[PDB]
């Protein structure tokens, strides 16, 4: 009765680590569906373009999908060209780049998680590195191999190469291991950069830990109370407009906030410790 | 009791991304039914027409089906020839093309999702590119092949070609990889164009984010309250007409809105920030 | 309790697209039962008649079945020869052809859906095109074939033809692909004609979108209220007639509408915007 | 609770098309039991009689079974020889043939549905057409066959014929396809005749669509109210007769309708628009 409610406190408080763990399980299961069912490397001069598109084109699609599902990217830009100075204010002219950096860094998580699982399953790199045709990086792969390594390297994936197939089986192990080292150098350097920018944003905060915990509680249910006020004032307005249409009556006046009050409550909020307001709707009510 | 109600808030708020994800799962499962069960490429001079019809004719059918299921295409055109100046108003003469651009762009989503899954499963392009018979684009496919590649290329799908079947197996890999590169160039450029026009429509909006959130709440249940008023005034009218038919009585008068009020409430709505009305039914009640 | 009621709103509002999707699933499953279990092509001079009857005779039966199940075809014709001028009125003498065009076009949907699934499964066309015996259209099928293609083409379905069975297997692929191109040319041109006549009927309507939505709500439950009035006046009439038969009594009079009022309420309804009546029963009550 | 009641309206309104679809499913499943388990063609001079009895004798039995289960054939004939002029009235002397045509045409549906499924499964026609022994119709089957087709055709079903069994396998395909063409010519011409006589009976009706819908509602529950009056007056009569037998009492009189009133209420009903009566029991109560 209340024991199951006691463990739903544990699955709602740690909700930012279940969401990032369900994103990793979807990225792993989607890469194994592309490499098994759809990917089959040719053995042509189009090896470089074919393997480098299966690596970077699903990363470009996941980046654009992060801009659609980000709710604070639409709060920033909706109605921008009416007056752009409400997004570029006079006191804090560089807060627009701080907010825009947060949308960009938050939507760069699922692209990086794609590039790491695709490099730890080294089939896309093996196809792309075969057709390299470069002066450097070709002596490193073919070091103690016969002389037909510099011409027929791009056929090592499909088989069907006349250079003694115990040599072909160890050229597919030297390329499958170069990709898995790059897959760990990307996980290790993106985890360190992610902690270094989160720790810098908290160390440079204007409030301490206890006031920031109240600020997050207020902003969470200013959103819930705003959905119930919109849903209450729109039932009273639609009931008024329908009775005066069918009965041909003149309506009683309906008081709504003006246009200057709607646009002032939609600005960008920056904290000031002299007068502590926790939203921009809190600020226009207290100041008038 | 209320825990399952708490997660139906999560499956009703994100309803525009479950609908677009269920459309992609139906398009993938329908392309695998056509390519496995029905598609079998001939090896004739009709290769070009056969493969290019299985690509573009299910895209033409899905485009017409998007015009039928679009509710705002019927609100725009019903009763057009009575007076066309209610669709071409005097102040905003170019809003008719802005609305018509929204029906066209919204119904172009399922055609593009068909053309991408059909190109990532490269059977329709392999049949169509075989019978090309062009001066260009035929030297690119047959580069280091024997001289019977320029005459018997259209038989490479069915087998039964006398050009050493290790050469036929790598002409089917060079065409199956050219189609999968075009399948990713279409997903990447349609995702970028879809974000560029949505961001331009929000940046050029007349209202800010908070007033647009109230406008969407009002328009959603002006539709629910209109279905309950129509259902209430049609029960009272059918009860009146049936008692005066069987009993041979003369009826009491039933007040309804006139024809000039029905047609004025069906016009096209454009926001004005001087007098803020949230529908065209709100405007004819307040103005008279 | 009310959550399942909330999704039955979604399965009752979109009821005209579940009915047309269940008709397509029955037509596909019925064509696979005829082509697998019953159809087996002979190899005689009766190839043309045998395959062209399995194509067009189930389309003729589905057209006649659409006239039986159309409720508005019986409302138009019942009691026609009593006075034909109630179906050919004086003001609108061409509305009879507009209504008769709607019964004909609505019952032509299941014949066209039969002819498309039968042509996309190319067994009926392969049997019928084999026995063509025409000067044209026989050189197009036999282009680079031996000279026994002009005489023994009608045996290519059954096998047992002495023209090198790798040639017989590619004459069955050139005919199975000509039928699937015609199956897509019929789906594409019937979808475009279906949208062009629906859009012309809405653009030429006498009322706008909002008045047409009330008109459909009234006509739906004038039918429900008429079934409850007939069921109420027939219980009171059968109770009266049975008590005066067994007890040998004389009955009290039972007031019913006259014959001139029954026939005037059964005419064909055309909207007029000067006096807006939503049925022909609404018109004879208000006018007398 | 009421949702399942809402769909039983759909399975009771369309009750005349579920009954005709369950008759077709029983006729198909009964023909496959006769042709698989019981039918085995001899190869004698009795081929013509054996196959033509399995075709027409189950059609004769299904026709007689339609006269037993027709309730309006017993209402017409019961008590005929008491006075035949109540079935041959003076004003409408040709209504007796119109009613008798309705019993005959309604009971001719299951015979025609037997003859069509038996001809679409061409085993009964193949046995019967083999032993034809006619001057015509024997040159059409044996056109380009050896000379032992005119003498040993009746053995082609059982096998065991010395005319090169690739010729016997294509004489069994030319007869199995002649029967399936006749099976579609019977379905197509009986569907067209069934619509042509129903449309002529409705176009020549005395009442319009709305008065005919009330007439069908009254006749349906004059039958239900008559079963409850018979069941109520027979409980009161059997209680009276049993108390006066065991107690040796004299009974109180029980008023019943006379013999002239029982026979007048059992006549044949024809509508008159001058005095509109909806049954013959309605007419003898109002007229006396
Ligand atoms: C990369 C994501 C970085 C991130 O979201 O940092 C936010 C949060 C730290 O702040 P707080 O919510 O714990 O107060 O971090 C966390 O609470 C834990 C995030 C754990 C991310 C990996 C989980 C598989
Ligand atoms: C349950 C998962 C949804 C969720 O709670 O999102 C929370 C998290 C936002 O956290 P933050 O931006 O405040 O640090 O956003 C995320 O962690 C993103 C998770 C997205 C998972 C999508 C899986 C289809
Ligand atoms: C894969 C894409 C993941 C993604 O875009 O996450 C971004 C967003 C976090 O930003 P915010 O909404 O918390 O401000 O996370 C979300 O809010 C996404 C919530 C909805 C996810 C879909 C659920 C079916
Ligand atoms: C200027 C950028 C500063 C910044 O974005 O840090 C703030 C953010 C923590 O979230 P929040 O406490 O501001 O709600 O931290 C993040 O959103 C960082 C996301 C993780 C970056 C992953 C890059 C691979
Ligand atoms: C292509 C569809 C583009 C689109 O519908 O954009 C609308 C919406 C952005 O506006 P909003 O509803 O989030 O306020 O976009 C979204 O909310 C997310 C749409 C996600 C589409 C892909 C999901 C698989
Ligand atoms: C549940 C899916 C239905 C649904 O909610 O449609 C919502 C969406 C309309 O969103 P928008 O036009 O306001 O951006 O329209 C769509 O996203 C289209 C989805 C159509 C899915 C059809 C699947 C058979
Ligand atoms: C595949 C076709 C998808 C499609 O046409 O979506 C268009 C429409 C979105 O437009 P709108 O109705 O929101 O104005 O989406 C809809 O409203 C479709 C809702 C009904 C879908 C059928 C459900 C069985
Ligand atoms: C002029 C066109 C401007 C436009 O259509 O953008 C508006 C629309 C967003 O929906 P809404 O906020 O207007 O309800 O955005 C869309 O409907 C865009 C749909 C996605 C286009 C896909 C094309 C491949
Ligand atoms: C998203 C794109 C996935 C996709 O299109 O897979 C296509 C795949 C092609 O198989 P193949 O004949 O190319 O080996 O077809 C299949 O074999 C079926 C797998 C489809 C994915 C399962 C869901
Ligand atoms: C062919 C059928 C054409 C048709 O019935 O059009 C009627 C309707 C359009 O009018 P409305 O009911 O949407 O207001 O169309 C629709 O609502 C959608 C019909 C969808 C037909 C194909 C569904 C598989
Ligand atoms: C549930 C399907 C029955 C149904 O609702 O019929 C509705 C539709 C009539 O729509 P409309 O003529 O008003 O455009 O008529 C149709 O769409 C015809 C569907 C017939 C399906 C028969 C399947 C055995
Ligand atoms: C296959 C034949 C389909 C067909 O004839 O549909 C016609 C009819 C639509 O016309 P209407 O009755 O809406 O005026 O649709 C119907 O009303 C048919 C409803 C009854 C279908 C049988 C259900 C078991
Ligand atoms: C003169 C014909 C005009 C016409 O029939 O269009 C009206 C009708 C739409 O239904 P409704 O709005 O009149 O109830 O639309 C239809 O019934 C068209 C049915 C689809 C035609 C399919 C032909 C392959
Ligand atoms: C929509 C059109 C689908 C369709 O017509 O498939 C026909 C298919 C033809 O098989 P085949 O003999 O041509 O290999 O017949 C089949 O093999 C059965 C598959 C039917 C699709 C399953 C539902
Ligand atoms: C052969 C049967 C002919 C027949 O019974 O016609 C009667 C009826 C037409 O009158 P109504 O009952 O629709 O007003 O027809 C119908 O309602 C539909 C009969 C459908 C018969 C075939 C169903 C598989
Ligand atoms: C449930 C089926 C019984 C039924 O309702 O019979 C109705 C129908 C009579 O209709 P009608 O003569 O008034 O046109 O009569 C018929 O359609 C005959 C159906 C007989 C089915 C027998 C199956 C063993
Ligand atoms: C009704 C008449 C059906 C009947 O009599 O079938 C008899 C059948 C004769 O088998 P066979 O030895 O003649 O091949 O005996 C059987 O093989 C058993 C089948 C009986 C039908 C199943 C019920
Ligand atoms: C096979 C025979 C079918 C048949 O004879 O149908 C005739 C009859 C229709 O006539 P009517 O009773 O409606 O006047 O239909 C019926 O009324 C038959 C109803 C009883 C059927 C038996 C049910 C187990
Ligand atoms: C003189 C014959 C006129 C006639 O029988 O038509 C009337 C009848 C329709 O039934 P009902 O409306 O009279 O109850 O329609 C039928 O009963 C016709 C039955 C179908 C005939 C099938 C023949 C293969
Ligand atoms: C509707 C008409 C269907 C029909 O009559 O099928 C007959 C079929 C004939 O089999 P065959 O011996 O001619 O290969 O007999 C069968 O093999 C059984 C299939 C019957 C259909 C299943 C329901």
Author numbering:
A (entry chain A), B (entry chain K), C (entry chain J), D (entry chain I): 1 to 288
Sentences from the paper on this structure:
We determined the structures of CALHM5 in the presence of EDTA, Ca2+ or rubidium red (RUR) at overall resolutions of 2.89 Å, 2.90 Å, and 2.64 Å, respectively. However, these regions are well defined in the CALHM5 structure, where TM1 is poised parallel to the central axis of symmetry and the preceding NTH projects toward the axis forming a constriction. We observed extra amorphous density in the middle of the CALHM5 channel and five lipid-like densities per CALHM5 monomer annotated as PA1–5. PA1 is oriented upwards, with headgroups toward positively charged residues at the short extracellular loop. PA2–5 are oriented in the opposite direction within a cavity formed by intracellular halves of TM2–4, where a network of hydrogen bonds and salt bridges holds these lipid phosphates in place. But in our investigated structure of CALHM5, PA1’s hydrophilic head forms hydrogen bonds with surrounding residues including Arg32 of TM1, Asn121 of TM3, and Val37 of TM1′ (apostrophe indicates the adjacent subunit), whereas the hydrophobic tails fill the gap between two adjacent TM1 helices. Interestingly, we noticed that these residues are not conserved among CALHMs and some of them, such as Asn121 and Arg32 (Arg124 and Glu37 in CALHM2), are also involved in RUR binding in CALHM2.
